[PDB]
Amino acid sequence: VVTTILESPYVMMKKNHEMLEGNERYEGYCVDLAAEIAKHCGFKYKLTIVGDGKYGARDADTKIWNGMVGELVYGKADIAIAPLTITLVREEVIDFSKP
Amino acid sequence: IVTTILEDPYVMLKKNANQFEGNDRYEGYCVELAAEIAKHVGYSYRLEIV
Amino acid sequence: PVNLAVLKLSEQGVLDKLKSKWWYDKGECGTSALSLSNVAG
Numbered sequence A: 001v002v003t004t005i006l007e008s009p010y011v012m013m014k015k016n017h018e019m020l021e022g023n024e025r026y027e028g029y030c031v032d033l034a035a036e037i038a039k040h041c042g043f044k045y046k047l048t049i050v051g052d053g054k055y056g057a058r059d060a061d062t063k064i065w066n067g068m069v070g071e072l073v074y075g076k077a078d079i080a081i082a083p084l085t086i087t088l089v090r091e092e093v094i095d096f097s098k099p
Numbered sequence B: 001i002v003t004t005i006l007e008d009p010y011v012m013l014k015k016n017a018n019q020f021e022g023n024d025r026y027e028g029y030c031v032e033l034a035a036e037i038a039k040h041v042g043y044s045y046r047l048e049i050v
Numbered sequence C: 001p002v003n004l005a006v007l008k009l010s011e012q013g014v015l016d017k018l019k020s021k022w023w024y025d026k027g028e029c030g031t032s033a034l035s036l037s038n039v040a041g
């Protein structure tokens, strides 16, 4: 399972998405970046969009994470290849790769 | 123990290095970086050139 | 503790102030009409 997020330049939905089911529905930089990763990694990728439409931030009241970050900690998502900023609080909960 | 190399504004020996002892025998950028992290993590250090 | 300390320094802005000091603060450097000097003669 590969969790991503909808952006303008990164993850775009292609024209005639109804006539192409699977990984042909999307096209962009972040799609090809995942293919480069799976060139040297033994993993099967499925383009799964996060339902919330959020990057990840722990709310003040609930004290619980959401989106791609929320799916990582609670154990649903496997890998996340998306424009995600590497900050202090994220490193405490989930491990990050090199920039 | 800290391992480092001498090159330009990162690490260079202090003025009148003859009359200096320990960490007060060096000055630069990485000098100040070594000082900051040692406090936040919590251990005393000793600078040494490669 | 070191990896997180590096992130603690960067986000708050310790490195950026320190980089300003040793490069610039400790440094020793620093209309297109017809000018007056061209006609001065």
Ligand SMILES: NS(=O)(=O)c1cccc2c1c([N+](=O)[O-])cc1[nH]c(=O)c(=O)[nH]c12
Binding pocket: A007, A055, A083, A084, A085, A086
């Ligand atoms: N759309 S945006 O104007 O540029 C933009 C604005 C504000 C926050 C963003 C953000 C983008 N982004 O590039 O899509 C990614 C991103 N990733 C994170 O992890 C995060 O915390 N905040 C952001």
